[PDB]
Design a protein around this ligand. Structure first.
Ligand SMILES: CC(C)CCC[C@@H](C)[C@H]1CC[C@H]2[C@@H]3CC=C4C[C@@H](O)CC[C@]4(C)[C@H]3CC[C@]12C
Ligand SMILES: CC(C)CCC[C@@H](C)[C@H]1CC[C@H]2[C@@H]3CC=C4C[C@@H](O)CC[C@]4(C)[C@H]3CC[C@]12C
Lengths: 397, 397
C-alpha cells in the first residue's frame, strides 16, 4: 500500500461552518451534561462537586497496567527484532535453510501466540484488571500481535527475495514504528515537516474532552437505562423499548468514539510523531452498499485484515471463488472482535458475531443507504443493549 | 424589501452527501420509529396495526375547522378589500379627508380586531376545537391579521401619495396573494416558470412524512416522558432530569418542524403557486451573536415585525435610542407568541415570555456559538418540558 500524505477527512471537513456548528452543538451538549451532572451532585450531596467516581473504578490498577504495557513494549520491541536478526544471517549461511527457517518461524509463532497470546491474557485473568484497564492492554495485545506479524511478514519475503538474489531493519525505525498509528510495516517513510505543539495540544485536549464526554454519556444515558432496571417482567416490549431507547447512547458512543479514537487520538500521535501522512477513514456514513461500507471504516484494521489475511489466505488456499475468501476473512474479523469483547468484558453471548452474520447474509440477497442506516442504528442499539445488559446482569447477580 | 428569486438554503444545501446522509439518517430513524410502533401495537393488541389514534383526537372537529377557515378566507378576502375600495374614491373626492380617513381606519381597526380578533377566538372558545385544530386556525388568524395589516399599510401610503400628487389593487392579485407564503403585500411579482408536479408532489410527501414523524416523536419520546408521570416527588432532581431528557424530543421537534413547516410546507405552496422567488431563512444554526440570530430565523415573521412594527413604532415615537425600540418590538413579538400558545393550549404560565427576557438580558452584558447552542438546548428543553407539563397537568386533574 502507498502512503500518500493527505490528512484526515474530518480535519478538512470540519472547517465548513455547518459541520463546525455540529461540533459546537456537541460540545454545548457536553456543557449541558457537565452542568446537569454538577447540579445533580450539588443537590444530592449538598456540596463537594467534581468526584470522578467511575473513572477511579474503571482505571483502578493503573500501575499494574503501565508495568504490563512496559514489559509488553520491551518484549515486542526486543524478542521479535532479535529473533529476526538471529534468523537472517543463519538463513543466508546454513547449508539447509528449509528446516532452520521453519524452526525460527516456529519460534516466532510460539512467541506471538505464547508471549503476546498469554501474557496480556494471563495478567488480565490473574491480577484482575478493571474492565477499561484490561481493555486498554488487550487492545495493546491485539495491536502488538498485528504489528509484529506485519513486521515479520514484510521482512521475511524481503530476506527470501534478497537471498534468492543472493535488508535487515534498523533499531531506530522499528522503535519509532511500533509507536506510529499505522499497522503496516511499510511505515512512515513519508513524514511531516514539524511537530506543531499547539496543534497536538488541541488534539490531546479533544481526546480529553471526548473521553470525558464518553464518561458523561455513560453517566446520564447508560446509567439510567442499564443500572439495575431489574423489576423483571422479561417482556419483549421492555426489550424492544430498551433496544430503541439505547440507540441514542449507542449512536452517540459510535460517532464520538470513532471521532475521538481515530481522528484525534491517532492524529495527536501522528503529528506528535510527524507521521500524519495517511488517511484513517473515508466517509463511512456515505456508503451505497454494505460491502462498500466494509472497505471504508477503520481503514487501518481493514488494511491489515484485507491485505495480509485475505491475500495470503486466498493465495495459499487457491479457492475457485474469492467470495468464500471474503466471507472467511470477515469471519476471522468477527471472531477477533468477539474475542476482544470477551476478554475485556469477561463474557460469552457474542451478539456481535451472529448479528454481523445476519446483517451480512441479509444484505447479500439511496433507499439502500436508508436501509444501511436503519440496520446500523438497530444493530448498534442491540449490540450496546445486550452487552451492557450482560455486564450489568452479572454485576446484578 | 426586494424579493430576489433565490431558492431555500436547505434545498441547495441538501445535495451535499453528508447532509444527504443526515436526511437519510432521519428518515431511517423514522423507519425505526414506525417499526417499533407497529411491533409494540402488534404485541399489545395481537393484531390490527395502523390505528392512528392521536391524529383522530387532535384533528377532531375538522368540518368545523374547514367551515371556520372558509368564512375567514371569505371575510379577509372581501371585507378589507371592499372597505379599501370604498375608502379610496371618497378620500379622493371628499372636501375634508382628515375625518373620513380616520373613520374608515376605525372601520378597518374594528374589523381586524373585531372580526379577526374575536371570530377565530370565539369559534375556538365556543365550539371547543381540539388543540391542534384550534392551533391551525389561530395560526390562520395571526397570518390573516398580519397579512391584512400588511395589505392596508402598503395601500394607504400609496393612495395618500398618489392623492397628494392628485393605484387600487386588483381582485385577482389579492386573491392570489393571500395564498402566497410571504407576509408582505409587496407580493410575488417575481414568479417561477412552471409548476413542477413531481417537485410539489415530493414536497407535499415530505410534509406528510414530517407531520407523521412529529406524530411518532410525540408517540415514543413525549408520551413516556410526559403522560401521567405523577408519582409526585415535586423534586428539583426530577425537574432537572425532565428538562435534560426532554432536550432530544424538543430539539428534534425544533429541527424537524422548522424544516417541515418552512422549507417543505411553504415551498410546496411556493412552487404550487409559482412564487418560490424568496428565501425564508438563512443559517440560524450559524450565529456568532444572539442579536445576529434574531434576524435569521423565520425571516417572514421577522420581516413583518421588523419592517412594519419597528419602523412605524420608532418613526411615530421618535425615541432617542433605537435599542429601546428593538426591545419593544421583541416584547410585542414575545406577547404575540405567548398569546398564540395561550389560545392554542388554553394556558397561562408564559415560560416563553420570561425565558425570552432572561436569555435576552443575559446575553446583553466561537465560544459564544457554544453558549448560543447550550442556551437554545436548555431553553427549548425547558419550554417543551413546562408547556407539556402544564398541558398534561390539567389533563391529569
Ligand atoms: C421525513 C423527515 C423525517 C425528514 C426530516 C429531515 C430533517 C429533520 C433534516 C433534513 C435536513 C436537516 C438539516 C440540514 C442542515 C443542517 C445544518 C447543520 O449544521 C445542522 C443540522 C441541520 C440544521 C439539519 C437539521 C435536520 C434536518 C432539517
Ligand atoms: C468534545 C466532543 C464532545 C466533540 C465531539 C465531536 C463529534 C461527536 C462530532 C464532530 C465532527 C462530527 C462529524 C462530522 C461529519 C459528519 C458527516 C455527517 O454527514 C454525519 C455526521 C458526522 C459523521 C459528524 C458526527 C459527529 C462528529 C464526529
Amino acid at each position: 500500500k502507498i502512503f500518500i500524505a493527505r490528512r484526515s477527512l474530518l480535519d478538512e471537513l470540519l472547517e465548513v461552518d455547518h459541520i463546525r456548528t455540529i461540533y459546537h452543538m456537541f460540545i454545548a451538549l457536553l456543557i449541558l451534561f457537565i452542568l446537569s451532572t454538577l447540579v445533580v451532585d450539588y443537590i444530592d450531596e449538598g456540596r463537594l462537586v467534581l468526584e470522578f467516581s467511575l473513572l477511579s473504578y474503571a482505571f483502578g490498577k493503573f500501575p499494574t497496567v503501565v508495568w504490563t504495557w512496559w514489559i509488553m513494549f520491551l518484549s515486542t520491541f526486543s524478542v521479535p527484532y532479535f529473533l529476526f536478526q538471529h534468523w537472517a544471517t543463519g538463513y543466508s549461511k546454513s547449508s539447509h535453510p528449509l528446516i532452520r527457517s521453519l524452526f525460527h518461524g516456529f519460534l516466532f509463532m510460539i512467541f506471538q501466540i505464547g508471549v503476546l497470546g498469554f501474557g496480556p491474557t494471563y495478567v488480565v485473568l490473574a491480577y484482575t484488571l478493571p474492565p477499561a484497564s484490561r481493555f486498554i492492554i488487550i487492545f495493546e495485545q491485539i495491536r502488538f500481535v498485528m504489528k509484529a506479524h506485519s513486521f515479520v511478514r514484510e521482512n521475511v519475503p524481503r530476506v527470501l527475495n534478497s537471498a534468492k538474489e543472493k535488508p535487515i531493519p534498523t533499531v531506530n525505525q522499528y522503535l519509532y514504528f511500533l509507536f506510529a498509528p499505522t499497522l503496516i510495516y511499510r511505515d512512515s517513510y513519508p513524514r511531516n515537516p514539524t511537530v506543531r505543539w499547539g496543534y497536538v495540544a488541541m488534539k490531546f485536549a479533544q481526546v480529553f474532552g471526548c473521553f470525558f464526554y464518553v464518561y458523561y454519556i455513560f453517566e446520564r444515558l447508560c446509567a439510567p437505562l442499564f443500572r439495575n432496571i431489574k423489576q423483571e417482567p422479561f417482556s419483549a416490549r421492555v426489550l424492544v423499548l430498551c433496544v430503541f431507547n439505547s440507540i441514542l447512547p449507542g449512536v452517540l458512543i459510535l460517532f464520538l468514539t470513532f471521532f475521538a479514537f481515530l481522528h484525534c487520538w491517532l492524529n495527536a500521535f501522528a503529528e506528535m510523531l510527524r507521521f500524519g501522512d495517511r488517511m484513517f477513514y473515508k466517509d463511512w456514513w456515505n456508503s451505497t452498499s454494505y460491502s462498500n461500507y466494509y472497505r471504508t471504516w477503520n481503514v487501518v484494521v481493514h488494511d491489515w485484515l484485507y491485505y495480509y489475511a485475505y491475500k495470503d489466505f486466498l493465495w495459499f488456499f487457491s479457492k475457485r471463488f474469492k467470495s468464500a475468501a471474503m466471507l472467511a476473512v470477515f469471519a476471522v474479523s468477527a471472531v477477533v472482535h468477539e474475542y476482544a469483547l470477551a476478554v475485556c468484558l469477561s463474557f460469552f453471548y457474542p451478539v456481535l458475531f451472529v448479528l454481523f452474520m445476519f446483517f451480512g447474509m441479509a444484505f447479500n440477497f439511496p433507499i439502500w443507504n436508508v436501509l444501511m442506516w436503519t440496520s446500523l442504528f438497530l444493530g448498534n442499539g442491540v449490540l450496546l443493549c445486550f452487552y451492557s445488559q450482560e455486564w450489568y446482569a452479572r454485576q446484578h447477580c
